[PDB]
Symmetry: none
Subunit: 72 residues, 2 copies
Amino acid sequence: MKQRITVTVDSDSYQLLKAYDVNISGLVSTTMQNEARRLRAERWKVENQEGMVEVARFIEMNGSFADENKDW
Amino acid sequence: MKQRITVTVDSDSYQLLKAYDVNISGLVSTTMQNEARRLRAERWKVENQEGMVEVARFIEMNGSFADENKDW
């Protein structure tokens, strides 16, 4: 009558969720409901957008001095 | 040291995912990861959604600097 699905995490991200809101076990099956609905002659196709979000540069124009300097 | 997260489904949606692609156990900890990262508490913290573009220009500079010209 019941199925025990157990993802022995402690290392995986599961713990992250419960670490801040141990109310996901039910979510587990919830995430499947959305996928459940979704699963119907379709998967993703349209979802990935941009992909780039702040790559953190390291230049910001080095040629900038305001205290009598120009090292090298 | 492992943590056994057991969402005894059979009734919950878990089964739908495993009944059609029993490859979620890992997913459980993964789906929560994306949420784990995304964990930013509401949509109010610092600044808003970035990446606003009216067009699609790709000319931030000329190439290096303005120290030569001879448009031929």
